[PDB]
Amino acid sequence: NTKYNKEFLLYLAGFVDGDGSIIAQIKPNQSYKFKHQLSLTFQVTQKTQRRWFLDKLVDEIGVGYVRDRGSVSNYILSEIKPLHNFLTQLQPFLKLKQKQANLVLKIIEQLPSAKESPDKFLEVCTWVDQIAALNDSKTRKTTSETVRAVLD
Amino acid sequence: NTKYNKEFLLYLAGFVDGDGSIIAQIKPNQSYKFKHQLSLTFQVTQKTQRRWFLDKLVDEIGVGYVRDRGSVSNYILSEIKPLHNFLTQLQPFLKLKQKQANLVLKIIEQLPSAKESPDKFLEVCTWVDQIAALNDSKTRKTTSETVRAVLD
DNA sequence: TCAAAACGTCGTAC
DNA sequence: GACGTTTTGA
DNA sequence: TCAAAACGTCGTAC
DNA sequence: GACGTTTTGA
Ligand SMILES: [Mn+2]
Ligand SMILES: [Mn+2]
Ligand SMILES: [Mn+2]
């Protein structure tokens, strides 16, 4: 687990509160025991003409990748272990998205428990709802209620 | 002059690179000698439900103000002297808007001597052209070229 | 005549 | 910015 | 059955 | 985000 520079984490936290995103999703998927995937994503979005900035995130964080689609690019970090290491060191300096980062950390630690029992899986989905409530959520479709209707 | 904490500047520089703006305008106004106002503005925009974040900025920067218009709020720093002091300390930590920051610092330093000759005024106006170029400019009307047309 | 505020608009880059 | 659906590669 | 990637959509908050 | 137009008041 790499330890990040403090001056870098301070800058990055500011940028993240601005144009970053801490996302938790419940993704419908038949090939899972509970018919859903718990997905977490750290994301920093930026215009493609400035993807050089996002490339430097890949170099400094040491993990993750950049995806271009249209006129816009995104730094993506999804791997649960590095994501937990990174958000642990970024969380103290976040102001607008601190709670989300903490809920994500909380979710990742309780991930193996989430597969064991349907009750635990539902409660973790409840935390995903809390992250969604704190973000500027507009197009959310799958909630813990959706999961509760499936776990029967 | 007010000295700013380094860690405060590092975070803020990040958030500025994300949701902030360094704006330089040539405002057409007949009351001025050269029929144009040189206007500099440091801006930080945010959804009005997160207004407190910007209200916090005023207390920390110690100058400037917050204005609401609908679902969007802005922190504005227009006062030339506190702006120069602020930007001087913030500039080292900027990555996306560092060039435009430093250009603003040069305009401010040349403002008084730019009121003396119409040629130096035009030279300064070109510095604001460089700023609008570095920005994601989409609705710009008054450039140095239009200033040149009026000075004849 | 000027610094600064006030008020307003629009198209993406989030 | 913050989601959505679908596929890959174990 | 999973983690992760790939691919795709949409409404503002910049 | 990044501009625009108009007004205030020494
Ligand atoms: Mn933002
Ligand atoms: Mn931005
Ligand atoms: Mn933004």
Author numbering:
A (entry chain A), B (entry chain B): 2 to 153
What does the paper say about this structure?
I-CreI is a homodimeric member of LHEs family, which recognizes and cleaves a 22 bp pseudo-palindromic target (5′- CAAAACGTCGTGAGACAGTTTG -3′). Each I-CreI monomer binds its own DNA target region generating the catalytic centre at the dimer interface.
Thus, a 24 bp palindromic DNA target is recognized and cleaved by a I-CreI variant (I-CreI D75N) with similar affinity and activity than in the wild-type case. The absence of the central metal ion in the non-cleaved structures, would explain the different catalytic behaviour. To assess unambiguously the number of catalytic ions present in the active site, we solved the crystal structure of the two proteins in complex with both target DNAs in the presence of Mn2+, which allows catalysis and unambiguous detection and location through its anomalous diffraction signal. A high occupancy level of the central metal ion is essential for the cleavage, and the lower occupancy level of the central Mn2+ ion found in the non-cleavable targets (46% and 74% for I-CreI_D75N_target-null and I-CreI_3115_target-null, respectively) compared with the cleavable ones (100% in both cases) revealed that the non-cleavable targets interfere with the positioning of the central metal ion affecting catalysis. On the other hand, when the two enzyme variants were simulated bound to the I-CreI_D75N_target and I-CreI_3115_target DNA sequences, the helical parameters of A +1 were similar to those found in the ideal B-DNA conformation, with minor fluctuations typical of atomic thermal motions.
